[PDB]
Amino acid sequence: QSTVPRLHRPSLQHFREQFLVPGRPVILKGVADHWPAMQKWSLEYIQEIAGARTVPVEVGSRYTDEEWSQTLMTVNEFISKYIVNEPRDVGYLAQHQLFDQIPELKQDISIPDYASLGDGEEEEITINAWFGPQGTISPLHQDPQQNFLVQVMGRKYIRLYSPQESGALYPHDTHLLHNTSQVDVENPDLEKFPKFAKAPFLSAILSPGEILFIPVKYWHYVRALDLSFSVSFWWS
Ligand SMILES: O=C(O)CNC(=O)C(=O)O
Ligand SMILES: [Mn+2]
């Protein structure tokens, strides 16, 4: 159990050799801290630019829950019901291609140059928004591409487990959830999942202007500590 390392604007070669090729997480500083988003994206700005648009919203504590569901509403409705007014349930505008929907917002972000070290096309990079209140939780899971998760507003608590530790994370048996752990990271049932207790991990609090590199297939768990807006870039 240790902290994810933080590096200020490392060279492309240093990132490639020490992090990308070996598949090791790192937080990059001084890279996204000057996105216009970092100063422009307030709730008021998001309402002005996106408020009338329809977005998918996940409702419930964790997508692994039984009562969890997905609905559609405007961004203004999402803010009113799940952020500003004392909300009744946790809602999360998660994993949504908001920048394709609202191209004006693309002007406020940039793809990190480190993504050019991959073997894929820039036109195939997928950019997703993650916008929600304090307390959203994305259960421990792994993704099939590299990721840069950029924090714009608020902070997130992140726990990372290597693919080498997959046995101790008890992936779901069904094919559709095989990329998700059965374990609740922050309150694990150690009578049912004893191997989880000894599995090593990295953790961090990701703050505005920071980029977390999540290597392909690295298991990650994310809880928002404040009202939060993150932007993920999936690339190969
Ligand atoms: O930010 C979150 O809640 C979860 N993020 C991701 O799983 C991701 O960027 O791939
Ligand atoms: Mn993910």
Residue numbers in the entry: 181 to 416
Question: What sentences appear in the manuscript?
Answer:
JMJD5 is a JmjC domain-containing protein, present in both the nucleus and the cytoplasm. Building from an extensive peptide-based screen for potential JMJD5 substrates, our results provide evidence that JMJD5 is a JmjC-hydroxylase, catalysing the stereoselective C-3 hydroxylation of arginyl residues in sequences from proteins involved in chromatin stability (RCCD1) and translation (RPS6). Consistent with previous reports, JMJD5 residues 174–416 fold into mixed helical and β-strand topology comprising seven α-helices, 13 β-strands and 3 310 helices. Like most 2OG-oxygenases, the JMJD5 active site contains a metal centre, which is octahedrally coordinated by an HXD..H motif (H321 and D323/βII, H400/βVII), the 2OG oxalyl group and a water molecule, which is likely replaced by a dioxygen during catalysis.
